[PDB]
Design a protein around this ligand. Sequence first.
Ligand SMILES: OC[C@@H](O)[C@@H](O)[C@H](O)[C@@H](O)CO
Lengths: 423, 418
Amino acid sequence: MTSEKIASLRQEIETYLNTGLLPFWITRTVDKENGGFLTHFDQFGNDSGEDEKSLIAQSRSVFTYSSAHRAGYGGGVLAEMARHGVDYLINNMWDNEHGGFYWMTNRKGEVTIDQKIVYGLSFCIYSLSEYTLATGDPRGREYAEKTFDLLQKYAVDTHYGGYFEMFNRDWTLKGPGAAGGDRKTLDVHMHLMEAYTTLYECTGQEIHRRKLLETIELLVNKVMHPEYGTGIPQFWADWSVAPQIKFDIVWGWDRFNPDGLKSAAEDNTSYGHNSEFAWLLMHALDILGLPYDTYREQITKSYTHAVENGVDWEFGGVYVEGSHAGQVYDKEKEFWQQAEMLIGMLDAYRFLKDEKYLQAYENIHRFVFDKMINHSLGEWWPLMTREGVPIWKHMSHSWKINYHDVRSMIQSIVRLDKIAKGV
Amino acid sequence: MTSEKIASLRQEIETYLNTGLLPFWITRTVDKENGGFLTHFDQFGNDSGEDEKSLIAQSRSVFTYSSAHRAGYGGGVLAEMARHGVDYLINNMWDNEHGGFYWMTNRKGEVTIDQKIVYGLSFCIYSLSEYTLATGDPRGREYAEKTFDLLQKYAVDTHYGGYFEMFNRDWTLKGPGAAGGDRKTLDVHMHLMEAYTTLYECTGQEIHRRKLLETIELLVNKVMHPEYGTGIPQFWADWSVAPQIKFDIVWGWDRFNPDAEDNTSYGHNSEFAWLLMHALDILGLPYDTYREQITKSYTHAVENGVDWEFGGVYVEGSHAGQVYDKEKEFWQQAEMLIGMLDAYRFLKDEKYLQAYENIHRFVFDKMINHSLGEWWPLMTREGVPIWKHMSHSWKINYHDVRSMIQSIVRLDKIAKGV
Ligand SMILES: OC[C@@H](O)[C@@H](O)[C@H](O)[C@@H](O)CO
């Protein structure tokens, strides 16, 4: 891929990031009346009125503004916005009796769901660690560490390893099945690898290094498919595969059958998840100062599977999910999987040096810019038909904020520059 | 055994406990000048001079006095002694910057080894949880929980499970080999199960219940021999068996008996089994929850470890059943007293009561130094002392007082069952 093409792709991202995506959030999100962030915007960019400030929404905003700022974007206001978020997290969402952050507040900042959900706590560590790295405000590291310590105490399974993932306010484990107390999941464990990476970057402490590596090992040895290297979504405590169910606590709009199961509840993998894992693993290794070769086999399997099955060569973009063995189940185009495939395919090129990953990359890039970005507003359509007709028309809500897309724009520029240097 | 036999065994224990063993300690150990306990006593019961107040000696002292008091012995003085030791643990041995208890102080109470040693921290959780149950003073639970949380943060391996076991003062992992940072041991993980049982008994919180069960599962699934159910002493972090090594940090003496990596300890295995049954009692779960495991430990101990000729239990032998070391060490006798009684309660086979009486007669007739009230630490197979200290930095009164008290508890259960 020529230097001119590299530079064209990079300029397209940068101009869109600076004049479309960040302004969409900068001009809308700060709630000065109640604190924290407004994130419910309809297809016209107007508040759609939902009475929710979710942990995911608030922490993802903190992460986005901290990380965009630390990467050099937004012109200064992003750090101030992140600090605004962190105030909300601590003053409204931190449990001062039992510790940990609450799952849901309403718009006034009152607690409506007081459960302790490791998936959200993962995003608390991630975003508050990134916030301290970006601003030097020690509150971020302080609460990331508090939350890390509570996860070790209450969530780590000292026999089988890994983490139980959903608890009541008082940290007692929730019941079985949909209540979320008896499964260990790819989604939590991968995002913990992501959070621990930044926590370690922030603190430099051995325990955080040692447990980041323990988490990588868990993912690679237990969560990934033993043959195909692809992420298996759900396990019992003993790491035997569990039927993939919807939980009572959601943080996305994942499709299930009416009984709350996936159609192939035991043979279902997500190309976006697998690409996301692979590049976040490479980023952890960078932070650890280890070569990508440390997990060459795993990284190769993740990227190879994704480009072989998940890339829609004919119409552009990445499918939703499919079989570990190769069959596609759902050819719709959901926003966050495009974002994660952008980063992953550049890193697959950087590391594996196969032009097919650059071919895959521009495919996904062209789909994102020509079909998925709602250019009049600056945000991404959340769900489209295979061929790129919008199905869902919200710009954002309690679970779709700006964590995936801002990160993929910044981190795609980052890897395009590294590619450009290698001639 | 007859009601009359049980009553005699019980009275032998009870008289010795009240007139011999506890007075030995009550009259010697409280150090009012420096705080804490003196535990260095020679064969004549006199101070032998050592300049050490180990974490093991102090916390084990707190446990003995807390538990003997809670079971109703000592006419009250043992709670006052336990309190004295807790004062020392907190004010001289707790690390106010990094948390956890230091491994070693000197006689004046100054820290001399500031490492964080999980084996010692186990006994901190054990003794301090017992202290709060025994006295209602919440300092015990408070530091027991603080120690537990630190172990979850710094020592639990979130990948392979179980604990790394030795750390610098600042909780950074120590180095490989003798430094202690790359092995997982039966010693630490069995005693964590012991400690967590009393911690859960103390707090009643679900997290301690859940992690007690997890520790039991680690022992049963990772530490006990896959075929024989006997304890394997050392593992790599991945739970593959490691060559047995001595660590720089010791809590005992390496006896070289002048008369191998498949060796296991009959006393450890008996100890694990009865502590497991006690954990199951605290949990409300039936013994046969782990029937196969418990049957293996006790069966292997009675078949191979009991010296029918001279009395007492041997030191160690192979998993497959060959005896290696026929010397008579004090703590294995104590743990077989409790274990053989529990083996009879659960398995109902008469050989365990024959075994018990064998160990009991060896303890009372050969091993107790009846002029002082403490046990000889190590004897030849036949019953001649090899070492003659009564107590030091690692031999206190944890094993023996507990075995007297807990043997009475179980003899009383067996007598009702007859
Ligand atoms: O790894 C991707 C993430 O965990 C995804 O599963 C969430 O559902 C989505 O990011 C929320 O919009």
